[PDB]
Design a binder for this molecule. Sequence first.
Ligand code: TJV
Ligand code: MN
Ligand code: MN
Lengths: 137, 137
Amino acid sequence: MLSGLNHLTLAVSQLAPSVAFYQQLLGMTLHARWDSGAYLSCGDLWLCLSLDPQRRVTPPEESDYTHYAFSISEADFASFAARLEAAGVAVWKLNRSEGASHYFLDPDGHKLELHVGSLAQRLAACREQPYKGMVFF
Amino acid sequence: MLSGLNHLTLAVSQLAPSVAFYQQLLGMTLHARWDSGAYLSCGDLWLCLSLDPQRRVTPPEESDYTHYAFSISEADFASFAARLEAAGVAVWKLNRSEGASHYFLDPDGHKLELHVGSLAQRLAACREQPYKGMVFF
Ligand SMILES: NC(=S)c1ccc2c(c1)OCO2
Ligand SMILES: [Mn+2]
Ligand SMILES: [Mn+2]
């Protein structure tokens, strides 16, 4: 039986700017670094950055909707978004769903999100206003 | 600050086979589906499958090392891996370079992994068998 997400690994083209982005800009804890990668944590999340020459710096129009959302409190959301904006971090989408969301790109074009709200909150909203064709289990 | 992974969203090319893969084959809990997506959980992980016309079925030699690992116990690891193998699930990596792991592909070629062990356990193992140039903080 699978019990959760064990780790998220992102392929990166340049290790130093990716470490700076996740550790310094985004505030994650750096636990180890080696010639070709790094291990960080963000709460329970184990993040691995893996130096990969096959990673392309990918414009958002050229990648699909796969994306990684990090939790933040409502109270902290706006100042964190403003921090990313001050740092010149690009936005790839505007929020049009329930719960605050800020959609931003990492240095290689990985699609990231700040989101406020749990699955339970989303399901409650959907039960009141179901998406087209929605069925619950 | 950021507190963990709020959700993982995977773009999928065909919703029904992807739902079947994550729910039936991997055993995740299906909470809701709609014409363009589904919500599942795996322990505390919120997984969203999002129907995306841009998603391509991607062979593993064409994608970078970005991947998603799910936790499994030492007691369940081998039989779950063997069941995926017997079911014909494609693979993408064989060398265990980060501990006890099984590397497999979803129907669209998303790179998945079964892994036994926490970040703390991986750091302890790396102290004895470190990656080249490894530094611990
Ligand atoms: N087996 C299920 S729950 C199902 C099958 C097909 C569906 C669907 C749901 O909504 C759109 O088309
Ligand atoms: Mn999202
Ligand atoms: Mn891994």
